[PDB]
């Protein structure tokens, strides 16, 4: 009879880096999706597998809320079957994704004058990530044939890189906060209606 804590997600004072994306599980609560689609402060709102309007009349066993920050040009990668540094090495959606992708411009929050170097992204990785996989290893990336065993040098660089958000960047380089809602239907009693 109590509403789901969607405020703790969309309104979090701090967001996680895309490589270490945050995930909150939502269950046993009455989900009021009405205001979310009505919200004009959202720049991106694309649902896959379900209709945006036709959603309040649905019950799900689990609802996962993932949140992170990426570039504006990289928002198009938060979709099924996309490729890129974020979709391959940071956050990957399955081809049969059932959920919605929500994003809005956060240049007024996550950018500092001297550059906000708190938001990071995994730049190099040997293989693409599996769907809903999370990789937070800081092991030095070996690009060449010869290894390094911990030597930040040629063909051996740190796998993580900073965005360095400044308020004067173009919309493509500005920070965008993303919230991905996954709707899970298991053979268990349903908890989110």
């Amino acid at each position, epitope marked *: 009879t109590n509403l789901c804590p969607f405020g703790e997600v969309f309104n979090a004072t701090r967001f996680a880096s895309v490589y270490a994306w945050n995930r909150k599980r939502i269950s046993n609560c009455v989900a009021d999706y009405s205001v979310l689609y009505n919200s004009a402060s959202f720049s991106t709102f694309k649902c896959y597998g379900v209709s945006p309007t036709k959603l309040n009349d649905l019950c799900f066993t689990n609802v996962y809320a993932d949140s992170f920050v990426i570039r504006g040009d990289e928002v198009r990668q938060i979709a099924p079957g996309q490729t890129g*540094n974020i979709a391959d090495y940071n956050y990957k959606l399955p081809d049969d994704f059932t959920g919605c992708v929500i994003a809005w411009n956060s240049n007024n929050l996550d950018s500092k004058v001297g550059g906000n170097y708190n938001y990071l992204y995994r*730049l*190099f*990785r*040997k*293989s693409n990530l599996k769907p809903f996989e999370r990789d937070i290893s800081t092991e030095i990336y070996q*690009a*060449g*044939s*010869t290894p*390094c065993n911990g*030597v930040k*040098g*040629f*063909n051996c*660089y*740190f796998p993580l*890189q900073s965005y360095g958000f400044q308020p004067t960047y173009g919309v493509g380089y500005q920070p965008y906060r993303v919230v991905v809602l996954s709707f899970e239907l298991l053979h268990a009693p349903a908890t989110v209606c």
Partner: antibody
Amino acid sequence: QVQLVESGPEMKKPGTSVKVSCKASGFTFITSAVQWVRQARGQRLEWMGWIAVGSGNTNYAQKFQDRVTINRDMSTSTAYMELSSLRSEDTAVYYCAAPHCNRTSCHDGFDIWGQGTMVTVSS
Amino acid sequence: EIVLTQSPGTLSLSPGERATLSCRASQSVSRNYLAWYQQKPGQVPRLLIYGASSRATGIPDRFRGSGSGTDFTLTINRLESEDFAVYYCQQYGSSLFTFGPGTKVDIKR
């Protein structure tokens, strides 16, 4: 066609700056690294600096720390070298080199070289 | 800075002989990252050997590299006429890279 193409000839008065282009083709620019080497007429190769394309991290020799800044623009897949406070001693041919790489692995050496950029400084 | 030196300054050999060039590093290479380049007059350098002993693509098998720490060797088994040029070595494993002074291989007379 793994290629690396540079700017045209430059002729700058002493004390000004020159920015030499170095555009890549045929390979994934994001993951390799670009070094800059100059060579005076009939002299040896002189290493200036290098930049990692993905991170943008730079390293510069002692002689060129004061006046050289290497950057890159991965949207145009071009790395640049800027040399400020030019003088007659800077008159040389400037080369850029990079390893050929794909999405995940690189060559263990600088096998891709540019055609050269002639910079002439004289009052 | 790692100092790089080559010997000899000029190598006088006849076409057909075996050439042997030397490259010396002031300290141990950071990661066996020693490259050999060939430069004909008025041309761009051409990578011959990368990473100590690994031939680059398109280089004939007569070019070979060796070494490990501070003393490295470039060996041409049978010197062809197209091989008479200047040869530079470069270490590139420790932040700052450095070149050698070069070694000119000319026709013996």
